[PDB]
Amino acid sequence: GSRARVYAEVNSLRSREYWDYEAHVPSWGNQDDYQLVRKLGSEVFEAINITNNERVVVKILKPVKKKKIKREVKILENLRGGTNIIKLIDTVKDPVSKTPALVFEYINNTDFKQLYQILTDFDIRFYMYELLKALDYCHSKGIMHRDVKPHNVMIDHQQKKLRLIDWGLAEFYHPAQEYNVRVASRYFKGPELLVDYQMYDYSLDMWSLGCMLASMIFRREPFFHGQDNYDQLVRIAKVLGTEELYGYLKKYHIDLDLGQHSRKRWENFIHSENRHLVSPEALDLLDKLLRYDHQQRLTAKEAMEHPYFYPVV
Numbered sequence: 019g020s021r022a023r024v025y026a027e028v029n030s031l032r033s034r035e036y037w038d039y040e041a042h043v044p045s046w047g048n049q050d051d052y053q054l055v056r057k058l059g060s061e062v063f064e065a066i067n068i069t070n071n072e073r074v075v076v077k078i079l080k081p082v083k084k085k086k087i088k089r090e091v092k093i094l095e096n097l098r099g100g101t102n103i104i105k106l107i108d109t110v111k112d113p114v115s116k117t118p119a120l121v122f123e124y125i126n127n128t129d130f131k132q133l134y135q136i137l138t139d140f141d142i143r144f145y146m147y148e149l150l151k152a153l154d155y156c157h158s159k160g161i162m163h164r165d166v167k168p169h170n171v172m173i174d175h176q177q178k179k180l181r182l183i184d185w186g187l188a189e190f191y192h193p194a195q196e197y198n199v200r201v202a203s204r205y206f207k208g209p210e211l212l213v214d215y216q217m218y219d220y221s222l223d224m225w226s227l228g229c230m231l232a233s234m235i236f237r238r239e240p241f242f243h244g245q246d247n248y249d250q251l252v253r254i255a256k257v258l259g260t261e262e263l264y265g266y267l268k269k270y271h272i273d274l275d276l277g278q279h280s281r282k283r284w285e286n287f288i289h290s291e292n293r294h295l296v297s298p299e300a301l302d303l304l305d306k307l308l309r310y311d312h313q314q315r316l317t318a319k320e321a322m323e324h325p326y327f328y329p330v331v
């Protein structure tokens with residue numbers, strides 16, 4: 019088996035009300051207090067609260083879903099006021115359609131496709147640090163995000179603001195609990211998910227964070243571009259090495275079902291167009307995040323102490 023190295027028992031130490039999301043009963047206000055003005059790139063809208071003129075974000079939930087609405091609302095409520103976590107303002111329902119929606123603080127996202135082309139080395143350090151603050155917070159609150167990717171990391175580069183959003187895939191970590199491995203987006207799935215290892219933990223988010231770092235400093239996005247679930251692991255093995263994949267599988271007693279490849283040096287991904295983004299310290303932090311062995315990956319708190327972030331601290 020396996021368990022998390024840092025916040026393993028925090029949900030156990032809390033009231034059952036904290037993590038028993040199925041017993042959670044949201045109070046649904048009236049969505050007609052909100053004017054949905056601009057569809058953002060679930061259907062998500064920039065909106066105005068018509069009573070106080072406040073600019074907000076309204077995310078329309080899938081009505082049919084019951085359990086995942088309860089889970090997302092409870093997690094957002096537990097995480098409210100956490101650093102760089104999107105702030106849930108209200109839970110409302112449309113009068114006509116009775117469809118549930120969530121109201122959030124507004125953030126003006128730049129869109130990573132254009133943003134990642136103009137980021138400096140410092141910016142990447144800066145925003146990775148901001149994102150790690152979010153992850154250490156939510157992990158410390160016993161929650162795995164399980165969908166960390168550029169699309170769920172809002173960045174307002176004008177105001178230098180970051181919000182980790184979209185907690186509809188998030189779950190409470192309980193030691194030895196077996197989780198669905200088909201969470202997250204293909205490109206940001208840790209190998210533990212891809213080899214069907216169900217007793218994963220917060221470190222899954224640390225893999226995803228590493229993919230983001232690699233794509234940003236190397237300007238290859240997504241960094242691990244699998245064509246389907248299977249190929250996703252081959253893409254990873256093409257970098258971390260096929261023989262090292264087996265060593266990981268032999269550990270944790272995991273039965274795999276590719277080719278030969280051998281582990282690449284992170285330095286081999288450097289060329290003229292990303293050399294000014296890559297440093298030895300970025301590559302060392304990267305090597306400690308993008309590791310087969312989920313127990314060896316830095317925790318968010320450990321990653322924040324890495325020399326990579328000294329200039330940001």
Ligand SMILES: O=C(O)c1cccnc1
Nearest residue numbers: 062075104122183184185
């Ligand atoms: O999905 C969310 O939680 C979300 C989406 C856009 C903006 N704020 C939050």
